């Protein structure tokens, strides 16, 4: 199958699909599911292969104009013109929130009770930033019922970053050191999954899965930009259906 579900216990009526690079029309660098319209490729095939996506989900997916802001947005007003933003949340149910992503990492998130579901684009700017933290208080649903998932992204043996990235993290947040390791030079592998999980969990969300994939090194699975530079985008959605 091209495409995947979040492996959690979240309730009948929070659906997910978390696409892979495959089962779409897009070419060479942007082979075949390329759901960006940022990134170099043909227009009318990224728009062929978010029209299979629709196709699977059934909804409008609210696509976002991420600018690894820390800004939030209501999915059921972002249809109508693509806003400025990295997350968006919803609780009617008449649109699927979604992020795009080739390495950085992808929250979606819902509550115990299906009431509520959210997707966050987590670069290491905006979660250092506190995207996550806005998109909890966004969705105004109790964090210890409010389960997230990390999808798929870069994993901490690929992902090689500076002091500048570290500083923006363990500066304010020295415990995030424990999501790094010096690999000397002033060189270090960053973890997103545990940096994302150390902030969750400082938050007060209850229940945190996924984070098992890299994307660098699954590449019949996954685009990655440090794997291939100029390449598609993959997707994480999250919808209630029900």
Same mark, same amino acid.
């Given at each position: 199958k091209n495409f995947l579900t979040a492996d959690w216990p979240a309730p009948a009526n929070v659906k997910t699909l978390i696409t892979t690079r495959n089962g779409g029309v897009s070419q060479g660098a942007y082979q075949s599911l390329n759901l960006g319209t940022h990134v170099g490729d043909n227009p009318e095939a990224v728009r062929r292969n978010r029209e299979i996506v629709q196709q699977q989900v059934g909804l409008p997916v609210a696509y976002?104009?991420?600018?690894?802001?820390?800004?939030?947005?209501?999915?059921?007003?972002?249809?109508?013109?693509?806003?400025?933003? !990295?997350?968006?949340?919803?609780?009617?149910?008449?649109?699927?929130?979604?992020?795009?992503?080739? !390495? @950085?990492?992808?929250?979606?998130?819902?509550? #115990?009770?299906?009431?509520?579901?959210?997707?966050?684009?987590?670069?290491? #700017?905006?979660?250092?930033?506190?995207?996550?933290?806005?998109?909890?208080?966004?969705?105004?649903?109790?964090?210890?019922?409010?389960?997230? %998932?990390?999808?798929?992204?870069?994993?901490?043996?690929? /992902?090689?970053?500076?002091?500048?990235? /570290?500083?923006? /993290? @363990?500066?304010?947040?020295?415990?995030?050191?424990?999501?790094?390791?010096?690999?000397?030079?002033?060189? /270090?592998?960053? !973890?997103? %999954?545990?940096?994302? #999980?150390l902030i969750l969990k400082r938050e007060g969300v209850g229940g945190v899965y996924g984070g098992t994939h890299c994307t660098v090194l699954e590449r019949d699975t996954f685009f990655s930009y440090r794997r291939d530079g100029a390449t598609g985008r993959m997707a994480s959605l999250i919808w209630l259906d029900g």
């Open positions: 976002l104009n991420q600018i690894h802001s820390t800004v939030v947005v209501n999915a059921a007003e972002a249809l109508g013109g693509t806003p400025d933003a !990295d997350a968006s949340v919803d609780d009617t149910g008449k649109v699927a929130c979604a992020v795009m992503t080739a !390495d @950085c990492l992808p929250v979606l998130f819902c509550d #115990r009770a299906g009431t509520a579901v959210a997707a966050a684009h987590a670069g290491w #700017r905006g979660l250092a930033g506190g995207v996550l933290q806005n998109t909890i208080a966004a969705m105004k649903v109790p964090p210890v019922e409010m389960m997230a %998932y990390l999808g798929p992204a870069i994993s901490a043996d690929a /992902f090689e970053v500076g002091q500048d990235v /570290f500083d923006a /993290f @363990c500066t304010p947040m020295p415990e995030a050191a424990t999501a790094f390791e010096g690999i000397g030079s002033g060189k /270090f592998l960053a !973890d997103l %999954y545990a940096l994302a #999980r």
